[PDB]
Scaffold this active site. Structure first.
Site, mmCIF file in Angstrom:
data_model
loop_
_atom_site.group_PDB
_atom_site.id
_atom_site.type_symbol
_atom_site.label_atom_id
_atom_site.label_comp_id
_atom_site.label_asym_id
_atom_site.label_seq_id
_atom_site.Cartn_x
_atom_site.Cartn_y
_atom_site.Cartn_z
ATOM 1 N N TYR A 106 36.649 14.484 -0.456
ATOM 2 C CA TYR A 106 35.742 15.540 -0.882
ATOM 3 C C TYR A 106 35.989 15.971 -2.336
ATOM 4 O O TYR A 106 35.667 17.107 -2.706
ATOM 5 C CB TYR A 106 35.838 16.732 0.082
ATOM 6 C CG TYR A 106 35.511 16.366 1.527
ATOM 7 C CD1 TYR A 106 34.713 15.263 1.822
ATOM 8 C CD2 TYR A 106 35.979 17.142 2.598
ATOM 9 C CE1 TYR A 106 34.413 14.915 3.133
ATOM 10 C CE2 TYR A 106 35.675 16.806 3.920
ATOM 11 C CZ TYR A 106 34.898 15.687 4.172
ATOM 12 O OH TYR A 106 34.590 15.328 5.465
ATOM 13 N N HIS B 121 40.725 9.292 8.314
ATOM 14 C CA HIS B 121 39.319 9.514 7.978
ATOM 15 C C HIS B 121 38.469 8.272 8.231
ATOM 16 O O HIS B 121 38.799 7.196 7.744
ATOM 17 C CB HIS B 121 39.224 9.952 6.514
ATOM 18 C CG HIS B 121 37.991 10.731 6.197
ATOM 19 N ND1 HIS B 121 37.887 11.544 5.088
ATOM 20 C CD2 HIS B 121 36.801 10.808 6.835
ATOM 21 C CE1 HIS B 121 36.689 12.101 5.068
ATOM 22 N NE2 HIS B 121 36.012 11.672 6.118
#
Lengths: 346, 348, 347, 343
Positions: free
Chosen positions: A61, A127
Site C-alpha cells: 500500500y 499477501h
C-alpha cells in the site's frame, strides 16, 4: 453509535478484532495530496473512538505504513499502542513482484515494525497467496509462525482471491503441517463475501471447524467499488459482461427507485457475514466475533455511513431489506457467484 | 537401545502442545490407591527410560497423593541428562480429595504455583481443571478463565480440563469456543478417561466434534484399562463400576484365561491404542501413522510395564491386525449389554 | 465539480458580481472550531473560494463568527489576498432580543467588524432583521451606512429581515421619499421566502429590482432553517405546528415512496427559480441572473460538493422530471404553501 | 426683482447625481450658432445669479464650440464666491463635428482630460457620450465601458449618454443594465431632447421604463422649445410652417407668445407630473432635470418665473391652452425627423 469497545480486550485474542476494521490502504499519497481530507491522525482518532480500533495495512500500500506509522505516533497520549490492533502483510512488493523467501518475511515484518512505531504487530498475513507456487506459501507461513512464537506478532495468516485455494492451504496447515505451522490464526478473503459472490459464506463453517481457523476477515464488500452506481470501478478484473450486468442493475435501481446500489450491497455483506454466520434470533442481532469486515474509511462521511448500515442491520427489522436482496440477486441472475482469474491458480 | 525411540527426544520447535508424544507417563500409579510405599515405585527409572524412548511427557495432579512431590524429586535427580526443556509436564488443579473440590481462581493460582514448586520449574506445559463433573458448571468456566490468565502471562503454555462424562466435556468445550470466546476461547486440550477402551468406546465417536466443533488442539485418552477394571488380574481398587459390569468383565477375564491363554489387558491395550492414536484419521496400510492430535496417558508402575507398552505400540503401528480385530469383536460380544456401560460421576 | 464562476473580484467593481453561492458564516463558530470531524476554518474557506464561492457572509450576531473568520482570513493572505474575495457582514442586532440601530452604534459596530476581519473595507453591510425596530430607526441607521459607503469604508449597503412586504416598504421609501438622504439600497437579504414552501420573494423579485431600484438581492435559508429536510432537523423553528407537521409528513412521504430526501429537490428548486428563472432563459446551459445570490452554509466539503452538484444539475440538466416533482411537493404541501410566521414588530 | 432660490445652493451630502437641480444652465448657447461672438454672452453674470437661485449646475460639450473654455474662464473668475464644491459640472464626449465622431476608448479619455483642463477642475460630476445615434451601437457600449472606468477612477462621478431617438436610448440603457451588467451596469443619467415638449411627448411615456426597467437614476430633458422652433433645424419644412401657423394666431388671436406656454408645459409635464401630483404647491420629482437655454440674465429670470407659475398657479387655464395648441398642431404633433443611423 460506537460499534464496540475502544480498547484491546484482555485476555488478548485476535478474535477480538472489531467487526469493522479500517482499510488502511486508503491512507496513501493521493490522500496527503487532497486538500479536502483531514490529517490521517484525525481520521484514525475519530474511527478508533467509534470502536473501529484496528487498521489493516501492507507494504504493497505504498506510504500507508509510514503514514499510518507517522500518524500513530502523534496520538500516543489519547491512544497508546495497547488501545488498538495493527494488521499488516508481507509478500507482495509490487503489482507484479513477489518474494516469499523466509529472509524477506523477517525483514519486511521487521521494516513494518519500525514504521508502525511498535515492537509488535497483532496480525501478519502473507499477501495474495495465489501468485506463488504453494510450497513457497507454506515456508513463508513457517516464518510467520516462528515470529509469533518470538512475540513479534500475536497472530499469523494469509489472504488471496480464490476461496478454494485458501481452504486447501489452511486445511493442510492444520493437518499435514500441524507440527511446523498448525492452524493459522486468521485468513483474509475478499470479493467473495458480497451480494454478487457469496462463496465465502458457504465455506465459513469449513474454515472455522475443519481448518481450525480462529478468525476470518472479509474484504472488498463492494468488490473493489464494482457494487456502486456511476462506474466507480476503472480497471476492474471482472469480465465486461459482469461489469455491465452490475452496471445495469445499478442504474435500474437509481432510475425506478432512487436507490444507490452500495447501501443495500453494504448492508447485505454486513448482515450475512458479521451476524448470520451464527444462529440469530430477532434484532438486536449478536455479532459473530470470529468475523470482521475490512473497509476503507477515508472521510468522516464514509465512516458515519458504515456506522449507520452496521446499526441498521443490527437493530432494524429488515424484512424490506430481504426483499430488496432477493431482487438484486435475481437481477444479477446469471452472474451471481461469478469469479475472475487471479494468479497461477485456475 | 533395545527398542528405538517412538518419536523425538526433545520438545519440537516451534512449540505446540499437539507435540505431546503419542504415549504419556501417568502419575496416578503413585497414589494412595494402587500401592503403598510409592516411594519404592521405580518412577525415576521409568522416567529415565521413557524419556530416552521418546515418551518425554509426564502427567500428574495434586489429587494423586505424593505423586507431584515424588516426580519433582525424580525430575531433579535427572537434570544434567534430562533438562526441563527436554520434556513436557502436565498437572491439574481443583480437586483435593474425592469430595472436597476447590475451583476458586485464588485456589487455582495457588495450586499451580505449588505444582511449580514441587516440580522444580518456572513453567508448566499443560494444566487441567480436575474432574469437572463434580462442580457446578459456572465454577468450571470461572476456573478456566484463571488458567487462561496463567497462559497469557507465560506461567502455563496450555490449558484445559478433565472428567468422566464425555458429553459434559463437549458442552463445556463448546461453550468456551462460542459463548465464552472473548475471555476463555477454545481450550487447548481435554483429558477423557474410561471412554476410549474395549468396554467403552464413546469417546472415539465424539473425536471429530471435539476437534472440529469445539476447536480442541489435542485430546488425551486415559485409563485405557479403566482403572485396572479391564485387567485379567482380578478385582480392583475403589472402582465405581457396578457389580454386574465388574462381574461381566472379570468373567471375560477368567474366560480369556482358559480359552486361548491370553490376558485381557493385552488386546484391550492394543484396541485402545489402535482405535485412538491412529484410526482417528484415515489410514492406508501399515506403517500406520500417528494422529498427533491424540495421546494416551498410561498407567505404568514398573519398567517391565513401560517396555511392554512400547511393545503393544509397535505391534499396532506395524502389524496386520486382522486377527486382532477378530479377538476385539469376541471381547465386545461377551460384553454385550455391558458394552459402553457407564457409572454415575459427580453431579452431572 | 469545477468552479461555479470566477475566482477573483471582477473589474470594474460591482456588488452584483457577488457569486451565485455565498458562504454563510454563521456556522463558522465555536461549535465548529471544537469539532474534530471539522476541517480548520482557513481550509474550508480556501476550498470554497477556489470553487468560485469567493464571498463570505457573517455578523456580530453570529457570536465569534466574525473573529474566527477574521483570523482564518489572515492565515490565507498569501494564496487568497483580501482583493480576491467579498466580505459581507451586518450590524444592529447584538443578541437574540437586544437591538441597537443607533447611528453611533452602527459606526462602532462596522469599525469593529473591520478590525475583527483584518481589512480596511467591507464589501457589503446590512442592517440586521429590520422588523424588530421601529421603522424610522431603520432609515436613520441606513443614512449612517450611506455615509460609511460615501467614506469608502463600505462598498455597498442595505438591510435584511423576514417579512418581504416590510422589506419592500423600506427599500421603496429609500428610493423615493428619502432619495436625497439615502437613495436606492444596494442589496437586501431575504430568507425563508425563496423556497419550495414559500415563493413570496420570487413573486416580488421584479418589484424589488424595478420599483425599488435594488441592484442585488440575496436569498437565505433556502431550506427554511433546516425545515425542508427529512431529518426533523429544525432546531427551535418558529413555524406553526401544523406547518411543521405538514412539512415532515411530506418529508416522510418522499422517503417512503421514492427514497427521496426532501432537501435535494428543495435545494434544486430554490437555485433554479432564483438564480436562473428570475430572467428569461432558453434550453440548458442556463444563464445565471447576476442580480441574485443565495447564502448557504457549507461547513463541510460534503455540503460544499452537494451544493456545487445541485447547482450544476439545475444549470445544465433537462429538469423536466424535476418540474413534475416540484409540483408534487407543492400540492402535497397544500394550504401550508406560502404560510409565514410572525417576526419582530411587523404586521 | 428677486424670487427665492429654487433649491439648495451647495452640493448636498451624501453626494448623488440625483441632486442635479431641476433647471441646469445649458452651455450650448455659447455655440458658434445661437449668437455671433460667443464672447458677448454674459456667461459670468448668468452663472453668478443662477448659482445663487439654486441653479448650481451647468451643461456643456466640446461640440458646443467655445462653450467649455468660456465656461471654464467664467468659473475660474468666480472661484472666490463659488468654489468648485458648491455646484455641478456636466459635459460630453465623442462628437467632434457635424460629421466627425470618435468613440474610440482612447479619445474619450483625451476629451475628458481636455474638458477637465478647460473647466479648471480635477473631477467632473457627469459625462455623456454625445449623440449616440450616429455611431454603430457596439461602439457606444465600448465607450460607456471607458466612462464606467473613469467613474471608478474618480475622474467623473456619474456617466450616461445622450441623443435624439428616445427608443434607441431605451435600447442602449436597457442593455447596459441587463446584457452588460458586469462591465457597464446601469447608467447614471441620460439626456434626451425635443421629445419632452409641446410638440413631442415621447419622453414622457418612457419615463417609467427608463427609471424602473433600465434602473437609470436621473433623466434630463433638453431643448424644451425644440431648438427654438417654438418661439439649420432638422425639422421638415412642413413642420416649421405648421408651428408658425400656430404661433401667428397665438400672437394675434390672444397676443400670447407660444414659447411661454410651451415652456410651462415642458416644465409641468416633466419636472412635476412624472410623479403623482395633487393640489399645488407642486413637488419636483428629483429624478428629473431640464437643461435650459438661457442667453441673457432676463431670459434666466423669465424661466425662473415660469418655474414658479407651474409650481403654484392653478393652471386649469394652462391645461386649456396646452391642449388647444396640440389640437392646432394637428398631425405634426409627435412628429420626428431623421437622426444619424437610427431606423
Amino acid at each position: 453509535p460506537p460499534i464496540g469497545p475502544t480498547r484491546v480486550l484482555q485476555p488478548y485474542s485476535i478474535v477480538n478484532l472489531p467487526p469493522l476494521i479500517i482499510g488502511g490502504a486508503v491512507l496513501n499519497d493521493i490522500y496527503t495530496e487532497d486538500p479536502t481530507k483531514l490529517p490521517i491522525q484525525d481520521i484514525l482518532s475519530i474511527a478508533f473512538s467509534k470502536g473501529l480500533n484496528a487498521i489493516d495495512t501492507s507494504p504493497y500500500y505504498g506510504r500507508s505504513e509510514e503514514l499510518i506509522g507517522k500518524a500513530l505516533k502523534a496520538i500516543t497520549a489519547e491512544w497508546p499502542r495497547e488501545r488498538y490492533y495493527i494488521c499488516t502483510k508481507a509478500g507482495r512488493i509490487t503489482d507484479t513482484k513477489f518474494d516469499y523467501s523466509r529472509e524477506h518475511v523477517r525483514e519486511s515484518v521487521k521494516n513494518s515494525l519500525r514504521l508502525l512505531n511498535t515492537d509488535y504487530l497483532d496480525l501478519v498475513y502473507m499477501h495474495d497467496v495465489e501468485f506463488v507456487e504453494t510450497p513457497e506459501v507454506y515456508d513463508a507461513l513457517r516464518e510467520l509462525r516462528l515470529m509469533k512464537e518470538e512475540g513479534l506478532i500475536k497472530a499469523f495468516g494469509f489472504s488471496g482471491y480464490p476461496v478454494k485455494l485458501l481452504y486447501e492451504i489452511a486445511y493442510k496447515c492444520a493437518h499435514d503441517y500441524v507440527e511446523d505451522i498448525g492452524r493459522v490464526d486468521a485468513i483474509l478473503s475478499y470479493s467473495h463475501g458480497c451480494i454478487q459472490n457469496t462463496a465465502l459464506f458457504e465455506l465459513y463453517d469449513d474454515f472455522i471447524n475443519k481448518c481450525g481457523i480462529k478468525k476470518i476477515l472479509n474484504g472488498s464488500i463492494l468488490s473493489m467499488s464494482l457494487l456502486r452506481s456511476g462506474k466507480t470501478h476503472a480497471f476492474h478484473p471482472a469480465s465486461v459482461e459482469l461489469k455491465a450486468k452490475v452496471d445495469e442493475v445499478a442504474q435500474d435501481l437509481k432510475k425506478t427507485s432512487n436507490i444507490e446500489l452500495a447501501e443495500p450491497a453494504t448492508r447485505f455483506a454486513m448482515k450475512r457475514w458479521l451476524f448470520q454466520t451464527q444462529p440469530q434470533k430477532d434484532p438486536p442481532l449478536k455479532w459473530n466475533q470470529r468475523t470482521s469486515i475490512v473497509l476503507g474509511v477515508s472521510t468522516v462521511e464514509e465512516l458515519n455511513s458504515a456506522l449507520k448500515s452496521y446499526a441498521d442491520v443490527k437493530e432494524k427489522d429488515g424484512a424490506e431489506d430481504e426483499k430488496l436482496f432477493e431482487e438484486i440477486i435475481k437481477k444479477l441472475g446469471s452472474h451471481f457467484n461469478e469469479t475472475w482469474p487471479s494468479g497461477l491458480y485456475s
